[PDB]
């Protein structure tokens, strides 16, 4: 699968399909908030 | 003066600010609105990361300008 930047605005991490396009860090914060 | 802060969930936060307001203050306002600790906050305007000590006017942020908020863990 081709690499994709995270779906979060201004985040330069790579997102993953498990986190619905989010990177792991942002997906974790999304749970928090 | 009103500015907008877009979150990772695409949620848009409206803040009442002054051109003289520092980035640190804006982060405190975000904490009041969202409960997000300032140290985890990264503010982006025009693709550049904003330093806490600088002001909105320093970064040429205007009325109804939109800022981007990125959240990051602090491992230290
Ligand atoms: K992105
Ligand atoms: Zn991300």
Swiss-Prot record, chain A:
Zn-finger segments (A20-type): 1-33
Entry binding sites for Zn(2+) 7: 6, 11, 23, 26
Name the UniProt record assigns to this protein: A20p37
Species in which this protein is naturally found: Homo sapiens (Human)
Gene: TNFAIP3
Range of the intact protein held here: 757 to 789 of 790
Swiss-Prot record, chain B:
Modified residues (Phosphoserine): 65
Cellular compartment(s): Cytoplasm; Nucleus; Mitochondrion outer membrane
Modified positions ((Microbial infection) ADP-ribosylthreonine) in chain numbering: 66
Post-translational modification: Phosphorylated at Ser-65 by PINK1 during mitophagy. Phosphorylated ubiquitin specifically binds and activates parkin (PRKN), triggering mitophagy. Phosphorylation does not affect E1-mediated E2 charging of ubiquitin but affects discharging of E2 enzymes to form polyubiquitin chains. It also affects deubiquitination by deubiquitinase enzymes such as USP30. Mono-ADP-ribosylated at the C-terminus by PARP9, a component of the PPAR9-DTX3L complex. ADP-ribosylation requires processing by E1 and E2 enzymes and prevents ubiquitin conjugation to substrates such as histones.
Effect noted on mutating residue 75 to R/Q: No effect on ubiquitination by CRL2(KLHDC3) E3 ligase complex. Impairs ubiquitination by CRL2(KLHDC10) E3 ligase complex
Documented effect of changing residue 66 to A: Abolishes CteC-catalyzed ADP-ribosylation
Outcome reported for the amino acid change (mutating residue 60 to R): Decreases affinity for UBE2R2 in CRL2(FEM1C)-UBE2R2 complex
Effect of residue 74 to K: No effect on ADP-ribosylation
Sites marked Interacts with activating enzyme: 54, 72
Consequence of substituting residue 65 to A: Prevents phosphorylation in case of mitophagy. Decreased localization of PRKN to mitochondria
Residues with site note (Essential for function): 68
Protein name, UniProt field: Ubiquitin
Source organism: Homo sapiens (Human)
ADP-ribosylglycine modified-residue sites: 76
Cross-link Glycyl lysine isopeptide (Gly-Lys) (interchain with K-? in acceptor proteins) residue location(s): 76
Domain of life of the native organism: Eukaryota
Glycyl lysine isopeptide (Lys-Gly) (interchain with G-Cter in ubiquitin) crosslink, residue number(s): 6, 11, 27, 29, 33, 48, 63
Topology relative to the membrane: Peripheral membrane protein
